[PDB]
Amino acid sequence: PAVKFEEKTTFFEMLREHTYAKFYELCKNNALIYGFEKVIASVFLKINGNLQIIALSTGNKGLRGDKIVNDGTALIDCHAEILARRGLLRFLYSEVLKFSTEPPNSIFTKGKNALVLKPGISFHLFINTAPCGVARIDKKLKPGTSDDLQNSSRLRFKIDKGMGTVLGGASEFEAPQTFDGIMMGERMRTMSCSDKLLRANVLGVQGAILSHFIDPIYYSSIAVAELNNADRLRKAVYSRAATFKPPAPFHVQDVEIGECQVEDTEQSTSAAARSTISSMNWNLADGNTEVVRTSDGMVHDKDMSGADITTPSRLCKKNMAELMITICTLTKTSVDYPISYEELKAGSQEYAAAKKSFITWLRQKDLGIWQRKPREFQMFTIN
Amino acid sequence: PAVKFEEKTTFFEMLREHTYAKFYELCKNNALIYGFEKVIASVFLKINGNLQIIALSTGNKGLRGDKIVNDGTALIDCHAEILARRGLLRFLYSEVLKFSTEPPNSIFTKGKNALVLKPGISFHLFINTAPCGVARIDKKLKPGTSDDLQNSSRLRFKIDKGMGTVLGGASEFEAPQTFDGIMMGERMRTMSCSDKLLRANVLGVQGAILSHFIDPIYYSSIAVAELNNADRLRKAVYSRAATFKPPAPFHVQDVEIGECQVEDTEQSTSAAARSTISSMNWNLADGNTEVVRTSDGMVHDKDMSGADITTPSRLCKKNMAELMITICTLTKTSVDYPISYEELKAGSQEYAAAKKSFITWLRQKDLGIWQRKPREFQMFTIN
Amino acid sequence: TDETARKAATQLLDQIQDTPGRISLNFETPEAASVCPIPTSLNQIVNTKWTVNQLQEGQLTMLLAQDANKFKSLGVKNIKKGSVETQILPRQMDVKEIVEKLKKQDNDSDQFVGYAAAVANVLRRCDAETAQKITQAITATIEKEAPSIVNC
Amino acid sequence: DETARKAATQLLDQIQDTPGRISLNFETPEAASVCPIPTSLNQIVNTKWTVNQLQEGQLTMLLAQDANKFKSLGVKNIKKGSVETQILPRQMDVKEIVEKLKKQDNDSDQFVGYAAAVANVLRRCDAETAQKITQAITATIEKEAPSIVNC
Ligand SMILES: O=P(O)(O)O[C@H]1[C@@H](OP(=O)(O)O)[C@@H](OP(=O)(O)O)[C@@H](OP(=O)(O)O)[C@@H](OP(=O)(O)O)[C@H]1OP(=O)(O)O
Ligand SMILES: O=P(O)(O)O[C@H]1[C@@H](OP(=O)(O)O)[C@@H](OP(=O)(O)O)[C@@H](OP(=O)(O)O)[C@@H](OP(=O)(O)O)[C@H]1OP(=O)(O)O
Ligand SMILES: [Zn+2]
Ligand SMILES: [Zn+2]
């Protein structure tokens, strides 16, 4: 049962309890997702004391290097928080459409130059475990030496195999990743979930493509089911860029972290269920669960003859681009016909400038090198 | 208690008898370590017709996955033949100090570019049983497929809380180890004692840090009580890397392999006597025994009748580095500051090149991938 | 302890099961509101006419099924922006100086990723007849120079 | 049977009276035969050094010993960058390489597979033979396609 003494912590437990409660409700439809509770994350929408789960996802692995594609049909990262953010993006597209048909019905209202969230709307992220990277590499009460603390705050990246991250020391891996090189055998570097959450609180969670329509959206709170979790998560997520001054409208979100003070998920997260290779994601926008094979980053199914087939996931780059094109064609927004995925993302001057400033500031303050994917990942044309 | 059948090859018999006699002599000072002698190893200093034990150690288990540390205070490997090498390292440090003050008293002499061992002085290693890994076969390593002949030389490694030794590169082991990966329950891989003895025979026993002062030191012989294992022991520690040609200061030592006529291997302490968790080690340099808990690699003690105290071992990386800096300060050999443990080991140019060449050669010859520890294990600063 | 606190606790525990993922914190009584203490920074209570229950599962599918006439505009337009890297979309056209360099060069500390990339790039550009002459040639060189590595 | 047991009893005494120190009776063929050492380990040198001064706990005494009488060794330590040798390739088995080095529909994969096979063949080769394979491949490429590689 949902065991919690309803004192002094309840809200974040209610985030924890309702995440697992929704998960098992999804298992009632598709029992195939049994055992995926190892690493699960969710996003909640809060209004005036009311909560509604927006996106739910699980996963602790990523795309393998030899399975990369240039058409954007593969999910590069399948960690729980990343897929929760992607489902949140899909819900945001749905809400933008809802505004486009009935402004009163939607969470958005027309701002000065873009869609702005209505007053009282807040988004909260919950993770059953500490995000990989800086937030996990320390659990001791104190490090003692300040130097070992600052190298404990350096940017880290995951690799195409394994459930941990590798310290990307300064002046190392400055060479851009290449599509041919990764296919030749080189392991694909992808940034850790801690640095991805840092980016989410700096540049917003909405991403580059949604930045055409809406103002930046930030997580109001990030909840983890680990008992202490207090200073380390702050350092990993907000404090590293607390001195950064992003250009307008972006700002560094002073996100709040609240701890699930009982039933902290470590045994259910750090053993046994790691044998799974399939991740799943759910969102309010679609209302149904989708299971994605993490090794190749695509959702597989049995054909009409009972044989295995593959298809792109709804959270992939190509599907998001197609959804946004549908948004524009329904909203009557004029767009250039021949464009690529990165050209559309580069079409946001403010978001692109803020991202470049953030990466350059991370460069100057020697937090590390941000591991950009090869450009060929985003050169595919959509229409 | 009683040796047998003199006039045969019995120098190794004397080594075994004196190792056991020294262990039983250390029992009287500390009655806690009774029954540990199931897996015991020792190192002897030889000069002409005089023998002197300088390192003695016990243990057959290693560091647990969830108890790893980043400050280098934990003993990662507590196997008997490894803690013996660490005690030998401490003895060599003591001998370097003795050379600093009394050149005629120390075993070292001033060479062309580094301290060189005195003529006639040699070190001999004794192990109660066969080293873990290649040197022993009990189960499932039997004929039936000709491809298993390759596995007779391939590298093997240990696993935290695991038993026996497993081959490398099956489905998961072809990936780097990560601190935040071992945290939350990835299996930490430590190379088997058979492969570590191969590294000792190729790059020397002095290690990276002690290579700053002294030329490489090699075991003159390795003695294992277990009968008829001499052929396989020689294959595990010398033959499979005989063709390797390390840089000029290093060479592959043709270690003499010997066995004792009277021997026993039934003592394996795995539900054999009491399933001992802790281990002990003794160094001539210190002159007193020490007991560590291999589950965490720390010395556990009691004081004021009510407390449990965790204390780093004298063989831990932090203590070895502290001894190194004390030696340098005492001898006025200036060292850079700040400097990490990884930087200090990498500072030994000749040893680092030899180690890289050895690992690369092992990889090329399809012997296996040498499973390096995460860099976070050795990033701590020394001051 | 208190009966009101017990009632609020039972309310929230039952709400966990009645509709998972949907929460309604107690606000009908200030004492009963203490069962779920909102964080000080998250307690930004404000008057708004919109409410949670207006979110429906599968709303994206519902909105796509609507007719195109119901949908209004936002007064915006999207403009392409050429990436700072001007290199062409398929990197089959590796720069000629580059691909010659990684083939003529000797220091393969990149562990042959560069050489393999150059080999793939020259293979792609060559005619199908020239490509096959090249790849049996590379095969023969591999089987002749290093037979201990290939013929297992 | 003379002097053999008289030699043996000394070794039998050492294991009980002086644990950890072994003395072998040399310079007497009858006494030397009781515990013959291997000829590889027979490094008899007339050194002035003796093992008797290896005092137990010598490190403790030397550390508390005054720093004045600790003369310098001459050497000096300098850091070097811990080369981030992250294991670059995803390894593949030899039986794997042979098939992918043999496929004829390589152009459909844009020659990625064949080049990967070539790379991992080169990776597992020794430096001399890998370099010679490199020159051979460059030579056959320059011979077969001067049109594409302008040299
Ligand atoms: O997968 P996400 O974390 O959701 O973020 C991904 C992606 O990151 P991954 O490569 O790890 O998937 C890119 O980040 P890079 O790794 O390439 O830096 C990319 O960033 P760029 O577009 O700057 O390359 C972009 O993030 P953004 O939305 O800020 O553009 C992108 O999101 P999409 O998958 O939706 O493109
Ligand atoms: O004494 P061991 O238990 O065998 O420890 C060694 C030792 O490291 P320490 O100095 O920390 O004891 C090695 O160092 P050198 O032989 O080079 O002095 C080496 O470390 P590096 O290869 O990193 O230099 C290696 O570590 P690894 O396993 O990463 O190869 C290994 O440590 P483990 O005990 O962790 O096996
Ligand atoms: Zn993660
Ligand atoms: Zn062992």
Side-chain angles (χ1 to χ4, degrees), chain A, chain B, chain C residues 1-33 35-83 85-152, chain D:
Chain A
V3 186
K4 169 54 101 183
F5 54 97
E6 316 224 281
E7 298 185 332
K8 81 146 52 55
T9 279
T10 281
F11 177 74
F12 296 105
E13 215 55 27
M14 282 332 103
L15 262 58
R16 197 200 141 253
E17 300 337 281
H18 277 258
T19 296
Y20 285 119
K22 186 60 171 178
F23 182 13
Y24 295 126
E25 181 74 350
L26 297 167
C27 298
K28 253 71 181 183
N29 207 292
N30 256 349
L32 299 60
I33 54 198
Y34 257 24
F36 300 1
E37 49 113 21
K38 199 187 97 86
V39 172
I40 186 177
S42 53
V43 179
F44 285 79
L45 184 148
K46 179 175 174 276
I47 321 192
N48 233 15
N50 299 330
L51 277 314
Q52 166 67 51
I53 186 162
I54 281 314
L56 190 152
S57 95
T58 175
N60 47 83
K61 296 182 186 76
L63 175 60
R64 200 147 45 83
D66 46 278
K67 292 294 190 181
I68 64 175
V69 289
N70 64 340
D71 60 359
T73 58
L75 269 174
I76 314 300
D77 207 358
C78 285
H79 278 214
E81 36 273 61
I82 274 59
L83 301 214
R85 176 200 150 265
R86 300 195 83 81
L88 172 67
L89 303 183
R90 190 151 271 263
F91 168 76
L92 291 177
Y93 285 104
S94 82
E95 269 314 319
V96 170
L97 244 199
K98 197 189 286 169
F99 177 88
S100 307
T101 168
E102 296 86 9
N105 300 1
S106 147
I107 80 181
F108 287 111
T109 181
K110 176 126 145 73
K112 267 190 29 43
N113 34 41
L115 297 182
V116 186
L117 292 180
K118 284 176 175 174
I121 308 286
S122 295
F123 288 104
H124 308 269
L125 174 71
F126 159 71
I127 328 170
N128 75 358
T129 172
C132 63
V134 164
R136 290 218 299 239
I137 53 160
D138 207 357
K139 303 285 279 263
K140 194 64 173 180
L141 299 176
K142 59 196 290 275
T145 56
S146 63
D147 196 32
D148 209 19
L149 169 62
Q150 57 105 75
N151 47 255
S152 82
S153 86
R154 168 149 301 99
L155 249 62
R156 302 174 64 88
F157 59 85
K158 350 194 181 81
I159 219 77
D160 55 33
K161 184 88 32 184
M163 310 170 6
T165 78
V166 155
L167 199 285
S171 80
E172 304 299 328
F173 306 128
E174 331 174 57
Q177 304 188 91
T178 150
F179 196 96
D180 287 343
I182 296 166
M183 281 305 234
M184 285 324 156
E186 201 154 21
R187 313 211 82 131
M188 185 204 342
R189 292 109 67 182
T190 173
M191 290 312 285
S192 79
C193 296
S194 298
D195 324 288
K196 287 195 172 190
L197 290 172
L198 173 64
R199 180 203 259 222
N201 304 132
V202 171
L203 308 173
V205 310
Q206 79 296 330
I209 284 188
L210 266 165
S211 304
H212 286 293
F213 300 175
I214 79 177
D215 246 7
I217 289 183
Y218 300 98
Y219 287 140
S220 291
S221 67
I222 298 161
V224 201
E226 151 186 304
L227 293 185
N228 193 19
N229 199 263
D231 41 352
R232 287 299 298 183
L233 191 56
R234 283 272 271 100
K235 203 46 43 53
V237 178
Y238 155 46
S239 304
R240 284 187 288 171
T243 39
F244 184 43
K245 288 144 197 237
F250 304 86
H251 63 258
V252 192
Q253 177 82 334
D254 186 22
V255 71
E256 166 157 8
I257 312 115
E259 323 296 57
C260 309
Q261 280 292 343
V262 67
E263 304 301 324
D264 46 294
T265 45
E266 294 196 327
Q267 188 79 356
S268 310
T269 75
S270 309
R274 27 179 147 64
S275 311
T276 184
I277 84 154
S278 300
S279 147
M280 60 70 82
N281 66 83
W282 173 89
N283 67 34
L284 197 297
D286 307 88
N288 61 341
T289 173
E290 142 168 304
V291 183
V292 164
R293 188 176 296 163
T294 299
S295 60
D296 56 71
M298 263 99 72
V299 34
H300 299 258
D301 200 3
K302 300 293 186 173
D303 58 11
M304 75 314 314
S305 299
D308 309 339
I309 60 196
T310 191
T311 192
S313 165
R314 70 197 176 185
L315 299 189
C316 81
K317 291 174 158 56
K318 176 230 199 333
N319 280 54
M320 293 276 192
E322 295 298 332
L323 171 56
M324 194 287 329
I325 290 295
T326 309
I327 299 284
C328 286
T329 207
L330 288 170
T331 281
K332 322 299 167 62
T333 309
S334 61
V335 82
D336 307 44
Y337 193 131
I339 45 56
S340 59
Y341 195 79
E342 50 161 334
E343 278 172 332
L344 171 66
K345 288 179 55 174
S348 307
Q349 281 54 0
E350 314 196 300
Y351 188 96
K355 189 182 73 180
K356 190 160 69 74
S357 182
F358 177 58
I359 304 290
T360 303
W361 184 90
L362 282 189
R363 200 41 137 91
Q364 290 345 99
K365 291 287 189 281
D366 63 3
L367 285 299
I369 271 52
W370 193 276
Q371 301 301 324
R372 303 282 288 280
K373 292 311 185 313
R375 289 180 64 234
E376 286 71 38
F377 277 40
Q378 303 191 124
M379 305 222 66
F380 61 96
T381 299
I382 55 63
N383 211 94
Chain B
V3 85
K4 194 170 65 174
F5 196 23
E6 257 80 355
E7 303 173 45
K8 197 53 63 175
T9 47
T10 43
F11 167 77
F12 314 111
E13 287 275 16
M14 294 331 255
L15 260 59
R16 149 137 189 281
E17 255 317 326
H18 273 262
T19 296
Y20 272 107
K22 188 60 172 180
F23 180 84
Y24 276 157
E25 195 253 315
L26 292 169
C27 289
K28 302 350 199 293
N29 302 26
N30 220 335
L32 177 45
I33 50 80
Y34 276 122
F36 281 56
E37 85 289 335
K38 302 326 154 103
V39 181
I40 189 170
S42 55
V43 184
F44 288 77
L45 198 160
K46 183 172 184 288
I47 169 56
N48 294 311
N50 302 106
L51 259 281
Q52 168 75 66
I53 189 171
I54 60 106
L56 177 141
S57 100
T58 309
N60 72 325
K61 277 183 294 288
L63 189 37
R64 198 84 66 77
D66 44 317
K67 318 297 300 326
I68 68 166
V69 316
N70 62 303
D71 53 4
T73 53
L75 281 188
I76 292 138
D77 188 1
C78 297
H79 275 235
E81 42 269 18
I82 320 291
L83 292 208
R85 194 197 73 93
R86 285 193 165 272
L88 159 65
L89 292 186
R90 285 193 67 88
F91 171 75
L92 292 178
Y93 273 123
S94 83
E95 274 303 333
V96 170
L97 252 204
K98 196 134 55 161
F99 180 77
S100 159
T101 163
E102 290 331 299
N105 261 11
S106 177
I107 72 181
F108 289 112
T109 49
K110 183 60 176 182
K112 351 278 199 183
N113 38 359
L115 303 184
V116 47
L117 203 61
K118 269 188 171 76
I121 271 169
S122 91
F123 295 89
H124 303 242
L125 175 82
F126 168 80
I127 320 173
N128 181 15
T129 170
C132 72
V134 186
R136 57 214 317 210
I137 47 190
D138 188 21
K139 297 183 65 176
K140 295 184 178 179
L141 273 68
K142 66 187 295 181
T145 51
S146 58
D147 294 344
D148 205 60
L149 183 60
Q150 306 172 352
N151 309 356
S152 190
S153 325
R154 284 233 199 63
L155 315 182
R156 330 233 306 183
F157 56 58
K158 321 159 189 173
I159 282 178
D160 35 20
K161 238 297 180 179
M163 206 31 45
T165 317
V166 297
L167 276 153
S171 56
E172 338 184 346
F173 307 144
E174 42 267 77
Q177 313 200 82
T178 45
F179 201 92
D180 63 316
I182 285 71
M183 291 318 200
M184 150 268 302
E186 275 286 21
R187 333 297 334 271
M188 177 165 72
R189 298 101 74 174
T190 292
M191 302 291 329
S192 63
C193 299
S194 266
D195 298 289
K196 290 198 166 194
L197 285 174
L198 186 80
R199 181 199 259 215
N201 293 335
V202 172
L203 322 173
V205 305
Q206 76 295 326
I209 299 192
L210 200 32
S211 197
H212 275 284
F213 310 97
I214 73 177
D215 287 74
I217 292 182
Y218 297 93
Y219 293 133
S220 289
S221 40
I222 289 157
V224 152
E226 193 143 29
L227 223 34
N228 261 289
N229 198 251
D231 183 343
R232 193 129 45 70
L233 173 59
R234 215 185 77 90
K235 216 90 66 162
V237 309
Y238 168 74
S239 91
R240 65 186 160 136
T243 46
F244 182 52
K245 301 209 82 289
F250 298 86
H251 73 276
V252 187
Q253 177 84 333
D254 190 3
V255 151
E256 179 99 48
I257 293 306
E259 76 285 332
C260 304
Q261 178 235 31
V262 53
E263 47 86 57
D264 198 1
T265 313
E266 183 64 27
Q267 285 70 241
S268 61
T269 185
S270 176
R274 45 187 49 80
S275 306
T276 49
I277 303 327
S278 88
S279 48
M280 78 77 102
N281 65 78
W282 172 88
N283 327 325
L284 185 137
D286 280 70
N288 54 44
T289 185
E290 166 145 296
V291 182
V292 317
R293 205 93 77 62
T294 87
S295 59
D296 51 32
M298 306 276 180
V299 178
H300 290 226
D301 228 312
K302 316 302 235 73
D303 65 16
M304 34 67 90
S305 75
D308 186 299
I309 303 96
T310 326
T311 272
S313 166
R314 65 189 167 191
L315 302 184
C316 83
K317 298 187 172 184
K318 207 200 80 164
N319 282 53
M320 296 288 210
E322 238 307 352
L323 180 54
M324 168 42 147
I325 313 309
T326 308
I327 299 311
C328 288
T329 300
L330 265 190
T331 61
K332 277 151 310 309
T333 62
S334 54
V335 193
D336 293 347
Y337 180 176
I339 181 173
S340 61
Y341 194 85
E342 214 143 71
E343 279 165 296
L344 185 59
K345 299 221 299 170
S348 191
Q349 270 323 338
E350 302 76 319
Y351 190 94
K355 183 171 62 75
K356 204 182 91 33
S357 314
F358 179 54
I359 298 160
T360 300
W361 187 90
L362 293 175
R363 180 179 69 241
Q364 296 183 23
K365 216 61 53 181
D366 188 340
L367 292 161
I369 304 290
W370 192 273
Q371 324 273 6
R372 305 274 332 251
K373 283 296 183 300
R375 291 196 29 161
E376 290 81 79
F377 278 50
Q378 300 184 139
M379 277 187 180
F380 62 92
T381 172
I382 319 160
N383 52 18
Chain C
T1 54
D2 294 344
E3 188 163 34
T4 53
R6 177 63 177 183
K7 186 177 293 184
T10 50
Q11 175 192 9
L12 298 191
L13 279 276
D14 294 347
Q15 179 58 37
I16 282 164
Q17 186 174 10
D18 299 342
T19 306
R22 177 72 64 83
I23 315 192
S24 56
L25 268 65
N26 195 303
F27 278 103
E28 45 85 17
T29 299
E31 174 57 37
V35 71
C36 193
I38 302 179
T40 176
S41 69
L42 305 196
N43 204 29
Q44 190 76 0
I45 288 167
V46 69
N47 179 34
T48 165
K49 57 168 54 68
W50 200 67
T51 165
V52 167
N53 58 14
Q54 183 143 174
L55 299 178
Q56 329 66 34
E57 289 186 329
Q59 87 195 6
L60 207 185
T61 287
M62 274 180 85
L63 291 162
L64 295 194
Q66 283 268 248
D67 201 5
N69 64 337
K70 337 206 64 183
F71 285 31
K72 323 326 199 43
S73 100
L74 330 179
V76 298
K77 72 309 181 193
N78 299 358
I79 304 80
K80 86 205 314 153
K81 166 26 173 293
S83 52
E85 282 74 32
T86 199
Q87 301 54 0
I88 219 73
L89 284 72
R91 219 159 187 182
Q92 194 257 25
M93 168 295 319
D94 182 348
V95 178
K96 282 318 324 313
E97 175 183 337
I98 305 300
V99 47
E100 279 56 272
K101 276 184 174 179
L102 315 81
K103 291 230 313 308
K104 296 302 181 83
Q105 81 63 48
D106 166 317
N107 168 34
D108 264 352
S109 77
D110 194 40
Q111 201 180 21
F112 309 102
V113 151
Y115 195 80
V119 168
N121 290 322
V122 297
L123 277 157
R124 292 157 179 174
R125 296 200 190 120
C126 286
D127 169 342
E129 208 245 17
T130 295
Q132 44 88 356
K133 292 293 64 165
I134 286 173
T135 205
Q136 290 58 349
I138 293 176
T139 301
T141 288
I142 288 195
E143 320 256 32
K144 177 293 316 193
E145 182 58 47
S148 310
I149 272 287
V150 49
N151 332 110
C152 55
Chain D
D1 185 30
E2 180 64 284
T3 313
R5 268 62 190 193
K6 283 292 191 292
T9 186
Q10 330 181 232
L11 302 322
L12 290 167
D13 279 350
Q14 288 160 27
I15 65 166
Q16 184 173 7
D17 298 343
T18 317
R21 188 169 290 173
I22 303 87
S23 62
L24 298 299
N25 199 305
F26 289 159
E27 212 167 31
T28 295
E30 298 87 357
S33 78
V34 62
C35 188
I37 64 174
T39 186
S40 177
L41 310 183
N42 193 34
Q43 197 184 5
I44 298 298
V45 185
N46 49 255
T47 89
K48 309 301 185 179
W49 196 84
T50 46
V51 84
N52 67 319
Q53 54 67 6
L54 295 191
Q55 321 147 84
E56 285 174 311
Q58 61 180 26
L59 183 54
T60 313
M61 151 143 47
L62 293 158
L63 290 175
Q65 181 181 144
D66 194 349
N68 160 303
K69 46 178 39 41
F70 274 139
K71 293 180 286 185
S72 70
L73 316 161
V75 302
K76 191 301 307 303
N77 305 336
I78 271 180
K79 316 189 302 173
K80 197 57 59 178
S82 175
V83 283
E84 192 50 276
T85 169
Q86 190 311 335
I87 196 43
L88 205 137
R90 288 179 309 291
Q91 287 143 57
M92 38 148 75
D93 205 358
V94 193
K95 61 172 63 176
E96 151 36 60
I97 284 196
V98 172
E99 334 203 14
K100 295 198 64 283
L101 209 153
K102 204 47 29 173
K103 310 308 179 180
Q104 288 287 59
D105 301 345
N106 299 315
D107 181 359
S108 71
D109 296 331
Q110 277 262 96
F111 296 116
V112 163
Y114 187 83
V118 170
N120 309 23
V121 166
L122 266 295
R123 284 172 190 141
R124 284 205 248 86
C125 263
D126 66 72
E128 175 44 304
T129 194
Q131 173 69 188
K132 273 206 328 288
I133 290 179
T134 278
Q135 286 116 358
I137 288 179
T138 279
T140 168
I141 270 176
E142 193 172 293
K143 155 71 82 43
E144 225 42 32
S147 182
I148 298 71
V149 157
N150 188 18
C151 186

